Design a protein around this ligand. Sequence first.
Ligand SMILES: Nc1ncnc2c1ncn2[C@@H]1O[C@H](COP(=O)(O)OP(=O)(O)OC[C@H]2O[C@H](O)[C@H](O)[C@@H]2O)[C@@H](O)[C@H]1O
Ligand SMILES: Nc1ncnc2c1ncn2[C@@H]1O[C@H](COP(=O)(O)OP(=O)(O)OC[C@H]2O[C@H](O)[C@H](O)[C@@H]2O)[C@@H](O)[C@H]1O
Lengths: 187, 187
Amino acid sequence: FETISSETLHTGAIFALRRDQVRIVTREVVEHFGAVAIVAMDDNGNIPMVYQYRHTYGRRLWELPAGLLDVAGEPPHLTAARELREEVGLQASTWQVLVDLDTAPGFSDESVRVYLATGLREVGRTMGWYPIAEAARRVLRGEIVNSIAIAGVLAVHAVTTGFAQPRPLDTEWIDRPTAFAARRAER
Amino acid sequence: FETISSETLHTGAIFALRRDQVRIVTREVVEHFGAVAIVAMDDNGNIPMVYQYRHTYGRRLWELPAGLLDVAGEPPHLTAARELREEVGLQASTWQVLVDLDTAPGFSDESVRVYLATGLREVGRTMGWYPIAEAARRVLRGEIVNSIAIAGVLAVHAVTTGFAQPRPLDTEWIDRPTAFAARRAER
Ligand SMILES: Nc1ncnc2c1ncn2[C@@H]1O[C@H](COP(=O)(O)OP(=O)(O)OC[C@H]2O[C@H](O)[C@H](O)[C@@H]2O)[C@@H](O)[C@H]1O
Ligand SMILES: Nc1ncnc2c1ncn2[C@@H]1O[C@H](COP(=O)(O)OP(=O)(O)OC[C@H]2O[C@H](O)[C@H](O)[C@@H]2O)[C@@H](O)[C@H]1O
């Protein structure tokens, strides 16, 4: 395969649309920052989820706390730690990589890294807490559709059932986006 | 929330970019056809996966057979059955709904319905067959990152472990896209 020519069609707030000519096929790509999400498991197997309105679907979806990697030069897990704090007011002593997902492989370069945070502490001073098994059932029942939440929930479930293990923070993130950040079309 | 005004920024081959003013915030949306994917489980718990090049990431990813809902007026499962046939040369007697996922909730209206096909028959006349547990381990190991594949693989795994059940074809698909299809910007 080979990119013959790239042409920027639009640069927006959180993404840019680009069209390339490949190997020859037209391939439009949505350049994204990439994002991080957190499955914060407490000492009793419960994780917090937020209920956020998504204009794309015109309704509120149940999701894991998450945020865009829109801070040039900021380490993903630091981005993640801030989001966990800002979103559900929790600080965690242990951080590991749970699952990375390529959200829309067909038209965007967005990739999302999902962390597993443990050893939680309520700091500072709508959302809900769900036992992992319950969250897993909400997924297979279609009550949780956000793709990032699906991946994180089912993954931590696989971990809690002993089927799988969390991974090291330094695990390589193969498809971490870079293009849109490279643009820095701001200021 | 409320959409004040919509403005089309671009209409491409498989999607359109639109920008709306909300409740007041700018919200750019990628209108998509929606797609369907298939977890085809054989009589021994193995499922077929394809290894397809994704220009967005510049590499080949392991995925479930899948296709866009680009056939105006075609039922999703029929779309799905054609793809299973065309992709891995299999016909299945039983079709159920496994999991629906909203791929990129933050910038696209794309939603994907994942079916579970059983009672397989090799018809007609690269890909590979993976025992479900192995596929599940490839996910938690980061060897399977496609979000649709992650959802389908972990979901069928939850089903094979007895934790969850498949659902009826008539299960409601809450976020099935309609906007881009409504455009019919062709011919
Ligand atoms: N389509 C959009 N157009 C313009 N601005 C947008 C759009 N979508 C979100 N924004 C904005 O970016 C900011 C939201 O930032 P975050 O809270 O960091 O992230 P979030 O939108 O929740 O997304 C995290 C992740 O979840 C979603 O599933 C999304 O696909 C993404 O990977 C919002 O306040 C707003 O400025
Ligand atoms: N970014 C693109 N720009 C222009 N055309 C594209 C693009 N991406 C794919 N196409 C095309 O659409 C056709 C592919 O159709 P399908 O085989 O029906 O579907 P597919 O691309 O595999 O996607 C199915 C699903 O998987 C992906 O994860 C993608 O996010 C989507 O939901 C290709 O032959 C080609 O015309």
